Design a protein around this ligand. Sequence first.
Ligand SMILES: N[C@@H](CCO)C(=O)O
Ligand code: NA
Length: 404
Amino acid sequence: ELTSACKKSLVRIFKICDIDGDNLLNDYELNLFQRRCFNTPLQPQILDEVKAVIQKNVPDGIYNDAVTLKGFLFLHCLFIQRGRNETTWAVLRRFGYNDQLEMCQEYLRPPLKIPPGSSTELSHRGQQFLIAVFERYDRDGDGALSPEEHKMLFSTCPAAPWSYSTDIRKSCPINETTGWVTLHGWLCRWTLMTLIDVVKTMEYLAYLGFNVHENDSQLAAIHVTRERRIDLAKRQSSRSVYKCHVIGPKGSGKTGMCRGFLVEDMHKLIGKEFKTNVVNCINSVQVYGQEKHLILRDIDVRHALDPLQPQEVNCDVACLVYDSSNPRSFEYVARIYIKYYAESKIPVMIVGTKCDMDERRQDYLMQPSEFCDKYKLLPPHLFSLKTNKKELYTKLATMAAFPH
Ligand SMILES: N[C@@H](CCO)C(=O)O
Ligand code: NA
C-alpha cells in the first residue's frame, strides 16, 4: 500500500530524524520534529497509542520504546489509508517535498545575492550541524569516517557531493593510521565547497536536513564575508578562507608541495608520483591567534607562452613555484609575474623547491634572488619535503590575510 516513491522519501526522513544514528526514533526526536511539522508538542498518550498499533501489527518494529524504520514506514503506510493523508503530507512537506514527491527547488536553492569582493563561508550554525552529522555516522567513535560510513551519510542525497577515494582523501587532512577522513578534514572539504560553490553547499545541506534541524533556511549556514576598510561596524565580517593559486612550470615539484599541507610527515613524498589530479587542496593554519583556512589550487601546468585566464590569475595570494635545481625553470616564474602580477594588487610569493640537492644557476638573465629584489618581493622561499617545515603554509595565508 506504500508507493515506491513515498518509501524513498520516508526512509530519508527517518535517517534525518535519527539523531543518534542508532536506527531508532526515541522520545526526544519524535517530540522535537513534531514541532517542526505541526508546531505542537507530541502528547504523551498519542505516542503510547501510536506505539500500541505498531507493536501489534508489525514485528521487530519497536525496539525499546523507540519506533524502528519498519514500524515508522508502516505507521505512515497506515495514515494514507485511514483518510488522514495530510498528516503524512505535512511531514513530507517540511522535509522539502512537493505534490509530485520530488525535492522542491526553492527549498534546495534559496536566493542568495553575493556582491563582488565578498566570499561565502560556513556560519557557526552551519559548522555545528556538519559536526553533529559527522558524529552520527562515526560508529567507531574515533573521529573518522570510513568509505562505508561516508556513503551512509550521503544516502539521503541523490549522490555524494564529492568522491571519497579520489577527492576528499587526497585534498583534505586524513588519519595517518587508518587513512580515513577525520572530523577536521570533514569541515575542510565543506569549507572548500562553500567558498567556491555556495549553491551546491546549500543544496546538500537541505538534503541532510539542515532546514528541519535548525528550523530555518539554509541561508543561516552561510556567512558572507568581505575584506573591508574600517567602518566601526558592530558585527565584524573578516575573511577566514583564503584561496591560493599555485602557478609553476612542469616538473617544478609544486604538486608535492600542496599535498604536504595535509600531512605532518612530509618525508613520505620525496619521490612520489601523483597519479591523481587534485584541483584544490585545503587545510587550516593559525594566523595571529586565529584559525584560517588556506586553499592551494594546483593551477594546470602549461607552456610559458600559453595564456592565463583571470579565474586562474586572480586569487588571494599567488604562489609562483620554480625549480632551484633546474636552470631552465625560473624563466617561467619571471615571465608570468611580469605579465599578470606586476601591475596587480595580489600578494606574490616566489618559492624555490628542491634545495636539498644542488643549487644550480638559472639560465635566465637575473637570478631568483635578484628578481625578487628588483620587483620588491620577499627572497625566494627555500622549500623541501625532507625538512618537514610548514612555515611556508603559515606565511602564504598571512600574505592573503594582510596588506599589501
Ligand atoms: N512522523 C512522525 C513525526 C515526525 O517524525 C509521526 O508523525 O509519528
Ligand atoms: Na535516536
